[PDB]
Amino acid sequence: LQITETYERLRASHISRWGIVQTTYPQNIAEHMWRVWLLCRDWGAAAGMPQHTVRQACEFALVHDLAEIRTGDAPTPHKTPELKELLAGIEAQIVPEVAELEATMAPEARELWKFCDTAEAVLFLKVNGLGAHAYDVQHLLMEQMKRRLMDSVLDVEVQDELMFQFERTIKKT
Amino acid sequence: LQITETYERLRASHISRWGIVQTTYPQNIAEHMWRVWLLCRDWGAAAGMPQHTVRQACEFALVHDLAEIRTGDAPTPHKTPELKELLAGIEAQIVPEVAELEATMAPEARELWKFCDTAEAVLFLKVNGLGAHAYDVQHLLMEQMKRRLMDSVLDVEVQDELMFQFERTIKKT
Amino acid sequence: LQITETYERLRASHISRWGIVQTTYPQNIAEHMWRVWLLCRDWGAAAGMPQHTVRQACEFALVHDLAEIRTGDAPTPHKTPELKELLAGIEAQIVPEVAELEATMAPEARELWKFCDTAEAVLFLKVNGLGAHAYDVQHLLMEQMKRRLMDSVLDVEVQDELMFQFERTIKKT
Amino acid sequence: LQITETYERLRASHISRWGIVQTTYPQNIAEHMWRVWLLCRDWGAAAGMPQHTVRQACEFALVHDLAEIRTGDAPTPHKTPELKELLAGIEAQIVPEVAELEATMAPEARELWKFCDTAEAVLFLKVNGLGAHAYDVQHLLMEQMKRRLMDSVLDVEVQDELMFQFERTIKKT
Amino acid sequence: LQITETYERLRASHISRWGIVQTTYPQNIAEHMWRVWLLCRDWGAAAGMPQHTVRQACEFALVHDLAEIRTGDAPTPHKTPELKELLAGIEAQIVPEVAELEATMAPEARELWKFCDTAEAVLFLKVNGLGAHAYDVQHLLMEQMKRRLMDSVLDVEVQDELMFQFERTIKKT
Amino acid sequence: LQITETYERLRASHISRWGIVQTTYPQNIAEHMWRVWLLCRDWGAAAGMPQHTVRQACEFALVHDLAEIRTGDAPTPHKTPELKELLAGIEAQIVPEVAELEATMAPEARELWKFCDTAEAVLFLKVNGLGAHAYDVQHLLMEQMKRRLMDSVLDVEVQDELMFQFERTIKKT
Ligand SMILES: Nc1ncnc2c1ncn2[C@H]1C[C@H](O)[C@@H](CO)O1
Ligand SMILES: Nc1ncnc2c1ncn2[C@H]1C[C@H](O)[C@@H](CO)O1
Ligand SMILES: Nc1ncnc2c1ncn2[C@H]1C[C@H](O)[C@@H](CO)O1
Ligand SMILES: Nc1ncnc2c1ncn2[C@H]1C[C@H](O)[C@@H](CO)O1
Ligand SMILES: Nc1ncnc2c1ncn2[C@H]1C[C@H](O)[C@@H](CO)O1
Ligand SMILES: Nc1ncnc2c1ncn2[C@H]1C[C@H](O)[C@@H](CO)O1
Ligand SMILES: [Li+]
Ligand SMILES: [Li+]
Ligand SMILES: [Li+]
Ligand SMILES: [Li+]
Ligand SMILES: [Li+]
Ligand SMILES: [Li+]
Ligand SMILES: [Zn+2]
Ligand SMILES: [Zn+2]
Ligand SMILES: [Zn+2]
Ligand SMILES: [Zn+2]
Ligand SMILES: [Zn+2]
Ligand SMILES: [Zn+2]
């Protein structure tokens, strides 16, 4: 069950996202993780967050979905609290090193990562989603991203910078 | 959570299989279910199974993966007994009519359907799988299909006809 | 010429539709037939049509394009009366069992199937058509579907239910 | 019915070949016609055919499938003599200028074009065909190409040069 | 370095355009060159340009990007004067016969070809571009095409006919 | 010319590799950079290289191809010394921060990165290359990778560990 080999980790590019949403092509988790990393790096800096916090978010961004090489990527609405509890234990056996990183993340780093993880998905669908359901999902994700950010421990000035940058970015995407 | 609308059921063609395996294109569950239906129809008849049994397998084949419109399609190795128990309850809320059909299926109809469901996957990868992992998955599925068939309640003559037809079919695929 | 083998019938998923129209991906006839079957099942029931009629439409839906495994799928405008007459004889040699089903279909079952066959195509292009020609084809098909329905033997109440459901479905597609 | 507009002729790149054969992507008739043109140019010259003959083959190569913008591309085995007779009249209404060119082609130019048209298809499948049926089609086409060439009016020395070049080309494709 | 073999020239269909722009699929240079050829043929005739000029533009259209089989297709904004000077020498070694044709082209033939080369790209993106950057590129190309045409040696009546036909064509694409 | 905005950097996933090689799909530079990063991380550690060296290789891996968002990805054989000299100056204006990182890299970090950059390409083609040219490119890259490694400043024990891991990985890919 545990992922221990580079040949397995390389299969990040074989793991397709958006399994219940029509898209122009099957996005893989490697391109997703790179883009989330980029957002954490750029937007963490734009928001003036401490370097140690941005570094932690970026480190997690690059590995956070590796368990999906075994589990597959499952749709957000399907990940209820009960399923997430079961998946957390399974994922900790698959990638214990990722579980350890997740357990060490500071709340501010976690909230930067989560904002960027959802933002990347909205940005992806803006270009590559097809049809009414995909459009609804894009907009639902954007609402969820904003609600989570607003209720988070991030300072309001940081929240505002993240939304400033998100909106500038999506307009040009 | 429950799927009640035709516009949702049409999204069977938006649900991608093989989320952890490299393939030439993203196969959807609609084409999968049609092909499983075809195999149940043709191979149930070739094996001389009673018409009522073949009909039940075929009816289930056409709807059996509909819950994935909500849950996504998850990889076989990930569906452990504990996860399947949780998924069974969730899936019964998503598509109660499919759960009712599953609970009424005769063992012989279930075993025909399961053979055909796995055979379809092997046949798909024979053409459309890419790389060493996909090749291994194709062959693992074929071994699992044979083991399940051999240990099933189907008469040995039926088992042999199903394997006769499977092998003739894959040679020409 | 006759299709007699399961390995050939499985090639339904190798037969590409929309050969003269730009689309986001090549839809095959297996996913098309599954979706037409679904529409016949759901919309026949919504319209209160007799169970025997809906069953006949659904049975035909699952096999109706099998001859295309040999002939290819040809564009609707190209299928003039003279070509259709020639194709009918060829198709009857390719899939005599499908020709027999077609010759037994009740008019109401035929009109349900034809409505759903065209509706599926409109719905597909709504999501997956690309460019001005594809848009025109989508809208032409919708006009043809409505005209055929209005001139059909189906009761006006059935016609209205079919259009009610079609319009609700396409809005959400 | 007649194609008269550049916007319609540009849809050559919207017309997909291989409608009954699994391929890695949907090849269009524009890339096909360019490649057939290239083969006529290069192999006609290699074979020492008169410039006027090579020019005629090349001119036809660039337009020969334009009627498919209306008719679709249909599979070779389906084009029986009776269907071809009907299609010839339809195609002459669609693209009268192409029909006029075809009626003026010298036999040697026609045989160069036909060799190259089939060779291009073999070469395409060598790279992009998927599965056993596609492999069989590739090899059937190669046999048909050779038989037609051997029975043609082309001098044996020309036949041999065409096969010399075909075999060198496919080895490196 | 020099391209001398048909198997290499056939790789025109392996050379992907739009390497920095999101598109629905990877357009190759063979389909591009066919479409540019078509535009030169049709629009040169519509504009009443001399047959010898249209022929020269068409001949160049069919081969003009062959060096990209070695160099790759590079984005227009990246091709600065300094890079183009270096590329011109490299391309002349790759395809000396294409360089010779380019050096013989009459200015009016060159301007017809260049208009059509850019028009084809705009028309392609109209259908197949995805996202805001692709939209901007489509519109930038259209502005560049118009500016080059207006400043060219082509008579104003020819310029107007080319724009008349371009606008009619894109409206229907 | 300079890339300064997150919306531009996100277009890493819009930049297609393998522009002159047939592949099953268009790989983008984001998935490439993630995979190169992974190889640097895993294989640098397996080889016992100092943490500071592996970190530097990994940092560069994640950004090293960003200039291609403007320049496009060009084929290795085309990047002659003269072209690389010109590109180095252009790329330094596009992404000065990447040029600064490149100029600070220790030789051992550079050689780890270069090994992994080429290995990733071989591994990609092993799964996704199509046809004889792609096969030749895969094997040429593997020979180039080995020659560069053997002539590098890396200790022989490090070279051997890198080849040990590469060969184990490709066998399972
Ligand atoms: N509302 C939604 N409906 C369907 N799919 C969704 C939704 N939100 C996110 N996703 C996708 C994105 C990833 O593939 C996966 C979560 O990482 O789920
Ligand atoms: N061993 C396996 N590894 C990865 N994927 C697999 C395996 N077996 C089946 N599948 C896929 C097929 C369906 O998408 C889904 C089950 O219906 O899982
Ligand atoms: N007006 C039209 N123009 C082009 N293609 C069309 C049109 N109507 C239907 N189709 C397609 C759908 C199927 O592939 C096939 C008929 O089943 O034709
Ligand atoms: N034996 C065959 N089976 C299936 N398809 C075939 C066969 N031969 C040619 N083709 C395809 C190539 C074009 O799409 C079209 C003829 O131009 O038919
Ligand atoms: N402004 C632009 N940005 C990005 N890509 C562009 C632009 N203009 C043209 N192209 C593409 C089309 C061909 O692939 C190639 C030139 O033949 O460059
Ligand atoms: N020999 C070769 N022929 C063609 N393409 C090649 C070759 N080697 C590498 N590549 C590709 C990989 C990247 O897209 C790009 C370099 O990063 O060039
Ligand atoms: Li999807
Ligand atoms: Li997959
Ligand atoms: Li199409
Ligand atoms: Li095909
Ligand atoms: Li692109
Ligand atoms: Li490529
Ligand atoms: Zn994620
Ligand atoms: Zn199934
Ligand atoms: Zn149909
Ligand atoms: Zn042809
Ligand atoms: Zn060009
Ligand atoms: Zn690189």
Numbering used by the authors:
A (entry chain A), B (entry chain A), C (entry chain A), D (entry chain A), E (entry chain A), F (entry chain A): 3 to 175
Give sentences from the paper.
Among them, cyanophage S-2L is unique because its genome has all its adenines (A) systematically replaced by 2-aminoadenines (Z). Here, we identify the enzyme that is responsible for genome duplication of the phage S-2L, a member of the PrimPol family, and we present its crystal structure. We confirm its polymerase activity but find that the enzyme is not specific to A or Z. Instead, we propose that the absence of A in S-2L genome is explained by a separate enzyme, an HD phosphohydrolase that specifically dephosphorylates dATP and that we name DatZ. We give a structural explanation for both the specificity and the reaction mechanism of DatZ, based on three crystallographic structures, including one determined at sub-angstrom resolution.
Each monomer of DatZ takes a globular form composed predominantly of α- and 310-helices (70% and 4% respectively), with no β-strands. The electron density allowed to build the whole protein as well as 218 water molecules around the DatZ chain (175 aa), which is roughly the number expected for this resolution limit. The base moiety of dA snugly fits in the catalytic pocket below a relatively flexible element (as indicated by higher B-factors), with the P79 residue on its tip. A catalytic divalent ion is found in the vicinity of dA’s free 5′-OH group, even though no divalent ion was added in buffers during purification or crystallisation. An excitation x-ray energy scan showed a major contribution of Zn; additionally, an anomalous double-difference signal at 40 sigmas at the Zn edge unambiguously point to the presence of a Zn2+ ion in this site. The fact that no additional divalent ions were added during protein purification indicates a high affinity of DatZ for Zn2+. In the catalytic site, the side chain of residue I22 is ideally positioned to sterically exclude the amino group in position 2 of the purine ring of G or Z and provides an immediate explanation for the observed specificity of the enzyme. Concerning the oligomeric state of DatZ, we found that in crystallo it arranges in a compact toroidal hexamer with a D3 symmetry, where neighbouring subunits are flipped. The whole hexamer is particularly rigid, as judged from the overall very low B-factors, which is consistent with the ultrahigh diffraction limit for DatZ crystals.
